[PDB]
C-alpha cells in the first residue's frame, strides 16, 4: 500500500526515507549504496525499503467518489 512508519523488527522510523531512497536510486546510486547513505545498518530496516511495493500510486489513478 504505502511505506510503513516503523520497521516491524526493531522499531526505527523508515516512513520518512522512501522519497529520499527513490531520489538516490534515480540519481544513479545502487540500492546498497542508497541504503547505506540513508543510514540503515542492520538487515531488518534494509529489507523495509528494499522489498516495499508502493501501490498507493496505482490507487491514486482512480477518480475519487467525492465531488
Amino acid at each position: 500500500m504505502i511505506i510503513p512508519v516503523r520497521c516491524f523488527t526493531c522499531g526505527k522510523i523508515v516512513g520518512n526515507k522512501w522519497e529520499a531512497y527513490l531520489g538516490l536510486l534515480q540519481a544513479e546510486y545502487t540500492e546498497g549504496d542508497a541504503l547505506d547513505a540513508l543510514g540503515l545498518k542492520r538487515y531488518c530496516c534494509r529489507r523495509m525499503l528494499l522489498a516495499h511495493v508502493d501501490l498507493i500510486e496505482k490507487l491514486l489513478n482512480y477518480a475519487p467518489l467525492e465531488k
Binding site: D33, Y43, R46
Partner: peptide, 11 residues
Amino acid sequence: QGKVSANKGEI
C-alpha cells in the same frame, strides 16, 4: 539467500 540479499541491496 534473503539474509545475503538484505545486506547486499539486491534481490
